[PDB]
Ligand binder design. Structure first.
Ligand SMILES: Clc1cc(Cl)c2[nH]nnc2c1
Ligand code: NA
Length: 247
């Protein structure tokens, strides 16, 4: 990984030491990217709902992961499940349960720093993983992107600024998540969102993560050509809002 400090450095070391899990997936991979494109062609809002019990910014809720997944399955394009242990209180067991219990594609949401974590995603039933440009050297991104592809996944490349986007497009990202979250500070900053979205070619599937909590914000971003919307905290606090987001 890159040289990092603070909580990210902690999670990066945690990830490097993380033992590979015993698991066996129960259906072939369903491309999350391609399901988003099918939602787009059908003119149906594509929401990727996030399951997380906590966040380093202060989320703290308890909700049964299967019930939440079953509830969301009816309306989402897919689910992102936290498996990061210390800051998000997630685990591989949440993914194993959800990915075996719902039919929609699943992104494993964690800090990936090594191939065996992508193995873990695959064996646990996830359909794809995110790789984070701020965390990974360009060489590690290239390598892990190639490795995910070799398993049948198209990973989401997570970018926050123009420097990250430069990298993601150079390595040939086909699926990008544009986050307003500064992973260091934890603050949501939207200053550069409009510019970043507009720099991504039309045939790259783009997803926005930004503390979204209102249908209006989705409508605004969709006008810019955004394909899908990752929504975590507002749905963890009130899952019933999925209806405002997809109606
Ligand atoms: Cl896997 C992953 C990692 C990060 Cl930092 C993300 N930020 N927004 N969506 C994400 C998915
Ligand atoms: Na560095």
């Amino acid at each position: 990984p890159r040289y990092l400090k603070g909580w990210l450095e902690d999670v990066v070391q945690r990830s490097q030491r993380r033992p590979s899990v015993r698991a066996s997936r129960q259906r072939p991979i369903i491309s999350l990217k391609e399901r988003i494109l099918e939602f787009n062609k059908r003119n149906i809002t594509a929401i990727m709902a996030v399951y997380k019990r906590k966040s380093p910014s202060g989320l703290d809720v308890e909700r049964d992961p299967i019930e939440y997944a079953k509830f969301m399955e009816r309306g989402v394009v897919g689910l992102a499940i936290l498996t990061e242990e210390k800051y998000f209180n997630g685990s591989y067991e949440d993914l194993r349960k959800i990915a075996s219990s719902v039919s929609v594609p699943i992104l494993m949401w964690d800090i990936i720093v090594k191939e065996s974590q992508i193995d873990d995603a695959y064996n646990l039933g996830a359909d794809t993983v995110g790789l984070i440009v701020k965390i990974l050297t360009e060489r590690e991104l290239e390598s892990l992107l190639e490795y995910a592809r070799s398993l049948g996944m198209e990973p989401a490349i997570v970018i926050h600024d123009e420097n990250d986007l430069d990298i993601a497009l150079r390595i040939g990202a086909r699926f990008i998540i544009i986050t307003s979250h500064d992973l260091e500070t934890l603050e949501i900053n939207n200053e550069n969102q409009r510019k970043l979205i507009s720099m991504i070619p039309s045939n790259v599937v783009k997803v926005v993560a930004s503390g979204i909590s209102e249908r209006n914000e989705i409508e605004e971003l969709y006008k810019l050509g955004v394909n899908a919307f990752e929504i975590g905290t507002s749905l963890m606090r009130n899952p019933e809002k999925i209806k405002e987001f997809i109606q």
